Design a binder for this molecule. Structure first.
Ligand SMILES: CC(=O)N[C@@H]1[C@@H](O)[C@H](O[C@@H]2O[C@H](CO)[C@H](O)[C@H](O[C@@H]3O[C@H](CO)[C@@H](O[C@@H]4O[C@H](CO[C@]5(C(=O)O)C[C@H](O)[C@@H](NC(C)=O)[C@H]([C@H](O)[C@H](O)CO)O5)[C@H](O)[C@H](O)[C@H]4O)[C@H](O)[C@H]3NC(C)=O)[C@H]2O)[C@@H](CO)O[C@H]1O
Ligand SMILES: CC(=O)N[C@@H]1[C@@H](O)[C@H](O[C@@H]2O[C@H](CO)[C@H](O)[C@H](O[C@@H]3O[C@H](CO)[C@@H](O[C@@H]4O[C@H](CO[C@]5(C(=O)O)C[C@H](O)[C@@H](NC(C)=O)[C@H]([C@H](O)[C@H](O)CO)O5)[C@H](O)[C@H](O)[C@H]4O)[C@H](O)[C@H]3NC(C)=O)[C@H]2O)[C@@H](CO)O[C@H]1O
Ligand SMILES: CC(=O)N[C@@H]1[C@@H](O)[C@H](O[C@@H]2O[C@H](CO)[C@H](O)[C@H](O[C@@H]3O[C@H](CO)[C@@H](O[C@@H]4O[C@H](CO[C@]5(C(=O)O)C[C@H](O)[C@@H](NC(C)=O)[C@H]([C@H](O)[C@H](O)CO)O5)[C@H](O)[C@H](O)[C@H]4O)[C@H](O)[C@H]3NC(C)=O)[C@H]2O)[C@@H](CO)O[C@H]1O
Ligand SMILES: *[C@@H]1O[C@H](CO)[C@@H](O[C@@H]2O[C@H](CO)[C@@H](O[C@@H]3O[C@H](CO[C@H]4O[C@H](CO)[C@@H](O)[C@H](O)[C@@H]4O)[C@@H](O)[C@H](O[C@H]4O[C@H](CO)[C@@H](O)[C@H](O)[C@@H]4O)[C@@H]3O)[C@H](O)[C@H]2NC(C)=O)[C@H](O)[C@H]1NC(C)=O
Ligand SMILES: *[C@@H]1O[C@H](CO)[C@@H](O[C@@H]2O[C@H](CO)[C@@H](O[C@@H]3O[C@H](CO[C@H]4O[C@H](CO)[C@@H](O)[C@H](O)[C@@H]4O)[C@@H](O)[C@H](O[C@H]4O[C@H](CO)[C@@H](O)[C@H](O)[C@@H]4O)[C@@H]3O)[C@H](O)[C@H]2NC(C)=O)[C@H](O)[C@H]1NC(C)=O
Ligand SMILES: *[C@@H]1O[C@H](CO)[C@@H](O[C@@H]2O[C@H](CO)[C@@H](O[C@@H]3O[C@H](CO[C@H]4O[C@H](CO)[C@@H](O)[C@H](O)[C@@H]4O)[C@@H](O)[C@H](O[C@H]4O[C@H](CO)[C@@H](O)[C@H](O)[C@@H]4O)[C@@H]3O)[C@H](O)[C@H]2NC(C)=O)[C@H](O)[C@H]1NC(C)=O
Ligand SMILES: *[C@@H]1O[C@H](CO)[C@@H](O[C@@H]2O[C@H](CO)[C@@H](O[C@@H]3O[C@H](CO)[C@@H](O)[C@H](O)[C@@H]3O)[C@H](O)[C@H]2NC(C)=O)[C@H](O)[C@H]1NC(C)=O
Ligand SMILES: *[C@@H]1O[C@H](CO)[C@@H](O[C@@H]2O[C@H](CO)[C@@H](O[C@@H]3O[C@H](CO)[C@@H](O)[C@H](O)[C@@H]3O)[C@H](O)[C@H]2NC(C)=O)[C@H](O)[C@H]1NC(C)=O
Ligand SMILES: *[C@@H]1O[C@H](CO)[C@@H](O[C@@H]2O[C@H](CO)[C@@H](O[C@@H]3O[C@H](CO)[C@@H](O)[C@H](O)[C@@H]3O)[C@H](O)[C@H]2NC(C)=O)[C@H](O)[C@H]1NC(C)=O
Ligand SMILES: *[C@@H]1O[C@H](CO)[C@@H](O)[C@H](O)[C@H]1NC(C)=O
Ligand SMILES: *[C@@H]1O[C@H](CO)[C@@H](O)[C@H](O)[C@H]1NC(C)=O
Ligand SMILES: *[C@@H]1O[C@H](CO)[C@@H](O)[C@H](O)[C@H]1NC(C)=O
Ligand SMILES: *[C@@H]1O[C@H](CO)[C@@H](O)[C@H](O)[C@H]1NC(C)=O
Lengths: 317, 172, 317, 172, 172, 317
């Protein structure tokens, strides 16, 4: 009679369809998904140091908007900027706003060191009802609104050497009065000049008088500028009016810090990869959750699914 | 498959084999049975696990990058930022599509190969004592009890023990 | 005697050379080309809505150059800008010309809505012999050259609120007179100021007096600027001279529109893919016709040919 | 080819076979003839058509992008716009070059495989009634008329009908 | 290997063979010897040299590009310049990693294939005069002196000369 | 007795580990390295024409810094800028410094043709002790510092037509005096204007008076600008003070020239590929020496090594 010996392979009743070079639909015994398509809906607060901006943009926390006083000297790996954030101080703009926001976010710190400038002959600490702090008229905490003293605005010519081992980031501004009346009222002369320079750079701004649409009843505007002072260099401020002076310098660092716009809540969990939708696991090599990522993240792809075969072709019955 | 075994000269797989990927089914004088082949099963699993090992849990760290969403019209610079990101995403989407298609084609072929390898190994072991029926089954021309079947599966089958009996049955 | 049964495969007398991983030249029975290397020489007018600019650049059609009056309120999927196009109005430039051209081309429309500004106290509708329309001295159709009235240029302070549900695009300008004589002749004072602002933005321009090389006997120049006004915001124009005023706003949209420089003629045909050389078929995945494309197009590659084998190795005789 | 059949143990192809990619040539007592094998021909064509299906007519839609030709010298921003486009074109040119080389190598190997599959299928069908001459031809050791050849090509050849005759001719 | 010869049914390689990649070892009545097979060795070397020919000495020329190191903080434009270069380097690093992994897998499989091809070629040459022992060795059932071994290696072995002697020894 | 015929393959005692799709560590008989990870430490002076900037930046060689006089009219395929380079003339900056450096480096030449401008009524050839040439106070060799004559600075209005077949590159500047006293001392009036224009472009600069930190005892600054004049166009300079005039034009070309920052020495050897680390061989397709390259170079990758198998699997004993 003899015997029969048959060679064979297994099969499963629940196969999975995958793509190959020659076939768009072929069934294998098992597969694994290579595209992460879901987030847990919250930004895990570990292992990256998260700073929830709440109602404050990073720039408003930088300048010292009254609702942002709790952010003074804070540090972050990722600053989370909420879409509900709004300004509530003196109306301002930043020429190249995106670059200042980028360099501060990349620096990862709002450490601020006060410095004593010699503002001889002028009135300091100007305030406005558009910037209320503690039920009183106030101003940006890191900026010093200088105005006339005894109807005189003597020319300012102040130096501040950088004798540290690190770079200083100075934030200053120029006030654009709404009318020529306001220009006289504040600075006691018809036109101001502002020259901020170091041994490596020079910045000169002329105020532009004119009516802007009122924000919190203010038709004037401030324009924000910044200057970086290297060690061994000196900051020189030379102005005859309209100067919004700095109160000191910010430390500017290099590292892995950044900023992200998101409305997702912060959760007490651990996840290496952060997206605006929330944290996502990073076991898979690709993801289609969001092109904006921070941390050890899968690469964004357009596909919603990519099945990697992990078994042989399924040939049932 | 490129070797022609799985979905080839082997008509279908065995849903009843749950302890291995490849194996033997026999019918002899003592009954009919099934046994998984561990070495060929392990060979296919090791290769697939090698694929998974370099695709799973190997993400790179990125931190501060460029902005990718914009609320205002800006023009030239924003056009470039959007074009750079769209270019990158398309190239990575192509990489991912090609990667999965190549890997799946290779996975199907390598599992087909392991099946063919086990078949060829068994065929050479039987020497002149069996004939290939063409469907992955060997007609063994001698009495082959459970110990005899087990010796084939273990690689200890001595063809000389049964050669005289097999040749007599084969060549009438 | 028995029989002989031979297994074999076909072959052809006209094989094709292809490349592999191991061989740069191997002959197969058949192949297909994967690189499109030809165009039909004309831009098919379907399925994309083509607008032939003819003698007009998009910016000249925007401002209202006299030869571009037929382009008023036109729309397009693809604006075709001819290399023969030339300006024939008042000499002008656009700071960041490329960005204005880009945002208008991407918007895909020149719809313009007139608005009644209160230019109280000044002369409107200034013209020039450098901008002839209907054998008479004229000006950009969408711009309003304001000058003195009775040797007085009273300060302008005009608002225009955006109470629509869409964004408004305003095109305005600043006139740079060639001499101080021209500055007095036109605006009755030695120096002008222009401040254009909204609740979100501010733009301030000072004219720069000086001789430029004459174009159509004009040594002066106009500089073109633009401002986008969001719904609920207000346009505020505040000027004491040299203002080239807007006559209204353009609708600014989002969509698939763009612009392409090409000298190829427009044809009555259908083709998804457009290049400056003309339309190309898009059956192949790659092309080496032009890196500039619009529509469903093959990807540009450097190779002039890539043969994909569609048959076995050819082994004749 | 990686299987060694096409341009291998098969000396050359048949320009005279125009109704199929693979087939049989026979010489018996009734003459000599040719016949294409439809199943193996279809198997190779289906795989190549699967390749074409995901390369032909699958272009993406792009609309407003960046400028790529410039009439004036501008410097930094223009340097970046040119560098971005040159980078993209080089990566896509690499993708296209690698794609065609991989696909053509696979196409040559898969057509070689289908030839080897048909040869192995025919060999197992003949059992002990034929011997492999080594050039893709089988020496059949029994009278095999046209109906007998047709039964081999159709897969209905019963080796037991001719086994006694074949073994007698084989083993003198 | 996907064919199962190298590191497969061939137990190990021969460090003592230094004039070829594949070859024959024999034991007969006149002694035991070794000889390299030139054609199979050349076939594997030609394919690997074809790989090297399109990877070695084929660099592209680039000249003025973008800056890639920066001494000052600048913001938006510098962010884009850095992001463009980091994107390019990652895509080329991926290309290089995938290229080497694919080529090495193919190189191992093609050298395994050439070994299997030579084995199959020799097997068919011996017809009914030898049996596959399963370890890459053939038991030849007739007296086969050095000229006889040389005729097998040269492809001029006439199996009919020894068939009667071999069949008598095989089928006792 | 018969015979035994065994089929086999070679093996080696010194195998090499490579990676595959399925295995990160598998031993083959031989492999070749695909990543160049070393340089010879010097920049070979063939086949590319190398220009060693030594102590001079390209911009300083352009303007005519005294230590850069040997670079006049020189040409280059690759300009090598040393990190030790320093300026030693009048303190200056260049708005968009990176773009001027890029376009000059890409042009590959410092050929300069003198032109006779009609600077009627002013003093030419102003010098400074901050710019010593031959133990005397001097100035940038390609620039002309114009000042008052007899306490009069008559308005300048000069043209220079381009009747050549090539483009002209003009380098000019604006002097920012440290004080209003210096402004009167140099230009005999309180404020200057500078307008540089062609038929295609216009540039207007106003000086900004103010104290900058002193460099070589100079609190003033010069700002450098450039203008390209097409054939058939005309350069028009219109100024009433503070003009740093050009002495002629530079030829501006197109080609394969560039600039590289490097401290590696120049050697007498041949190498197609140049990196800041020095020249590297280009036989391999990839390299991890430096992302900055010039010439026929391998592509930069992050991997330090990639072994391409050139032999079968090594199965010893
Ligand atoms: C002896 C003698 O005669 N001396 C002369 C001086 O009297 C004279 O000074 C001027 O006198 C007139 C008297 O009619 C007037 O009081 C001038 O003061 C301005 O008045 C206008 C009209 O009310 C006012 O405009 C209103 O401003 C508010 C907002 O107010 C604040 C705010 O933002 O909260 C008040 C802040 O203190 C102020 N900040 C600083 C640092 O001073 C700011 C700032 O002025 C604005 O933000 C700039 O736009 O404003 C609101 O916007 C209302 O809508 C608006 O109508 C101005 O704010 C008053 N200016 C100041 C500085 O208080 C007064 O200057 C002098 C010059 O004319 O000549 C002497 O010879
Ligand atoms: C009672 C009393 O005495 N009142 C005084 C006024 O008379 C006086 O006005 C000035 O009077 C003088 C008299 O000699 C002169 O007419 C002034 O007018 C300018 O004249 C120059 C010289 O011809 C002329 O320059 C020529 O311009 C043309 C181009 O002409 C147009 C054009 O572009 O077609 C004409 C257009 O109407 C004009 N546009 C507008 C909106 O007015 C433009 C514009 O002026 C330019 O494009 C700006 O560059 O020019 C061509 O370019 C020739 O080459 C060139 O020589 C000016 O164009 C005349 N200016 C005007 C506005 O017409 C006249 O102002 C007043 C001030 O001095 O003082 C009173 O007290
Ligand atoms: C009849 C009559 O009364 N006529 C009046 C004129 O006298 C008068 O002219 C002014 O007269 C005063 C007299 O006290 C003084 O001399 C003015 O000259 C300036 O003096 C200051 C103070 O020393 C000096 O500043 C010093 O400058 C040096 C650097 O010097 C150079 C340099 O860089 O090497 C010298 C160069 O020649 C000069 N370049 C040119 C093209 O002239 C430059 C240039 O001035 C600076 O680089 C600009 O910043 O400077 C150093 O920096 C010291 O630290 C610094 O103190 C100025 O340099 C002197 N200016 C000049 C032009 O020489 C003199 O103008 C006139 C106006 O007041 O009124 C008449 O009525
Ligand atoms: C150039 O042109 C612009 C535009 O016209 C001028 O700017 C306007 O200036 C006026 C004042 O001169 C501003 O009017 C103020 O508006 C405030 C907001 O009004 C809204 O909200 C109130 C309720 O809070 C509603 O009742 C009202 O209908 C609006 O919806 C009001 O709060 C102000 O009222 C207070 O001040 C007035 C004036 O003293 C008192 O009579 C009131 O009792 C009250 O105390 C005031 O009405 C207007 O908002 C400005 N518009 C813009 C767009 O900025 C510039 O002044 C002009 N430039 C020059 C140099 O003249
Ligand atoms: C700063 O310096 C610049 C450059 O010198 C001055 O600009 C020049 O101004 C003059 C007028 O003052 C312009 O001259 C005009 O040129 C026109 C074009 O000339 C060309 O074409 C004509 C034929 O059409 C040819 O014959 C000629 O050779 C040229 O090839 C002419 O059409 C003008 O002629 C008309 O006006 C004059 C003057 O009234 C009459 O006499 C004639 O009959 C005719 O009606 C005139 O000749 C010159 O083109 C300007 N050059 C540039 C480059 O712009 C600035 O004026 C100066 N700035 C100050 C403040 O002074
Ligand atoms: C706005 O404010 C700035 C900052 O204060 C002013 O700029 C300063 O101006 C003074 C002159 O008024 C400059 O002082 C000069 O400094 C030179 C460098 O000093 C260093 O090196 C010397 C040795 O070379 C050391 O001894 C010294 O301690 C420093 O380390 C000196 O070389 C100068 O000395 C010469 O001139 C003086 C004055 O005539 C003579 O008495 C001396 O004998 C010698 O000949 C001089 O001391 C100072 O450098 C400037 N600082 C900066 C940062 O630029 C502006 O002037 C001011 N603006 C206005 C409009 O007033
Ligand atoms: C930078 O700071 C310096 C010094 O603080 C400023 O220089 C000063 O400028 C003022 C004018 O704004 C000069 O005052 C003048 O006094 C004379 C008296 O005769 C008078 O004629 C003028 O009407 C004016 O009142 C002052 O003398 C001068 N000081 C020095 C040392 O030169 C400079 O203006 C500042 N620059 C900027 C851009 O703010
Ligand atoms: C924006 O518009 C406002 C209002 O239209 C402008 O304010 C006005 O400015 C003019 C000066 O240009 C003032 O006229 C002045 O009158 C007094 C009379 O005593 C005289 O001393 C001056 O010589 C001049 O003639 C006018 O009063 C003033 N109006 C108001 C309400 O303040 C403003 O200038 C415009 N801004 C810009 C940048 O155009
Ligand atoms: C461009 O060059 C032209 C011509 O060289 C300059 O025009 C000239 O400007 C000056 C003023 O800077 C005029 O002088 C004036 O003379 C009258 C005499 O009545 C007097 O009232 C003034 O105080 C001044 O001294 C000169 O006449 C004028 N020339 C012409 C032909 O118009 C122009 O200023 C230069 N532009 C720039 C931006 O530099
Ligand atoms: C993530 O957020 C983006 C932006 O709002 C959205 O388009 C996308 O659908 C979201 N994905 C998931 C998985 O929530
Ligand atoms: C060659 O292949 C192409 C692509 O499939 C096909 O269109 C063409 O008909 C083929 N040629 C022949 C002769 O079959
Ligand atoms: C398409 O146009 C470009 C730009 O003029 C040219 O370089 C290229 O050769 C053209 N190609 C064809 C196929 O006409
Ligand atoms: C080349 O130079 C770069 C920049 O200094 C450095 O990071 C890298 O290690 C160098 N590589 C070699 C091989 O010297």
């Amino acid at each position: 009679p003899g015997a029969t010996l048959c060679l064979g392979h297994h099969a499963v009743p629940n196969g999975t369809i995958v793509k190959t070079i020659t076939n768009d639909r072929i069934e294998v015994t098992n597969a694994t998904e290579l595209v992460q398509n879901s987030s847990i809906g919250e930004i895990c607060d570990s292992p990256h140091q998260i700073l929830d901006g709440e109602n404050c943009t990073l720039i408003d926390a930088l300048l010292g908007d009254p609702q942002c006083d709790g952010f003074q000297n804070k540090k972050w790996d990722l600053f989370v900027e909420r879409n509900k954030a709004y300004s509530n101080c003196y109306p301002y703009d930043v020429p190249d706003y995106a670059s200042l926001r980028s360099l501060v976010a990349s620096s990862g710190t709002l450490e601020f060191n006060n410095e004593s400038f010699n503002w001889a002959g002028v009135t300091q600490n100007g305030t406005s009802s558009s910037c209320i702090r503690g039920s009183k008229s106030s101003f940006f905490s890191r900026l010093n609104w200088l105005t006339h003293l005894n109807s005189k605005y003597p020319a300012l010519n102040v130096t501040m050497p950088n004798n540290e081992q690190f770079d200083k980031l100075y934030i200053w501004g120029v006030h654009h009065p709404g009318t020529d009346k306001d220009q006289i009222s504040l600075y006691a002369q018809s036109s101001g000049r502002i020259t901020v320079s170091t041994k490596r750079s020079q910045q000169a701004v002329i105020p532009n008088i004119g009516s802007r649409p009122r924000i919190r009843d203010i038709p004037s505007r401030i324009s924000i500028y910044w200057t970086i002072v290297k060690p061994g260099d000196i900051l020189l401020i030379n102005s005859t009016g309209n100067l919004i002076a700095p109160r000191g310098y910010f430390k500017i660092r290099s590292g892995k810090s950044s900023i992200m716009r998101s409305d997702a809540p912060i959760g007490k969990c651990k996840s290496e990869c952060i997206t605006p939708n929330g944290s996502i696991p990073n076991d898979k090599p690709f993801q289609n959750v969001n092109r904006i990522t921070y941390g050890a993240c899968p690469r964004y792809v357009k596909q919603s699914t990519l099945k990697l075969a992990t078994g042989m072709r399924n040939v049932p019955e | 498959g490129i070797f022609g075994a799985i979905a080839g000269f082997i008509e279908n797989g065995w849903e009843g084999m749950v302890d291995g990927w490849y194996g033997f089914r026999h019918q002899n004088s003592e009954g009919r049975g099934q046994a998984a082949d561990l070495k060929s099963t392990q060979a296919a699993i090791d290769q697939i696990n090698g694929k998974l090992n370099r695709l799973i849990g190997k993400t790179n760290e990125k931190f501060h990058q460029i902005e990718k969403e914009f609320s205002e019209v800006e023009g030239r610079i924003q056009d470039l930022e959007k074009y750079v990101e769209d270019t990158k995403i398309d190239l990575w989407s192509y990489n991912a599509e090609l990667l999965v298609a190549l890997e799946n084609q290779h996975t199907i072929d390598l599992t087909d190969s392991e099946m063919n390898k086990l078949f060829e190994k068994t065929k050479k072991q039987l020497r002149e004592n069996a004939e290939d029926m063409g469907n992955g089954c060997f007609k063994i021309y001698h009495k082959c009890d459970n110990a005899c079947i087990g010796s084939i599966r273990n690689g200890t089958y001595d063809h000389n023990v049964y050669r005289d009996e097999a040749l007599n049955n084969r060549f009438q």
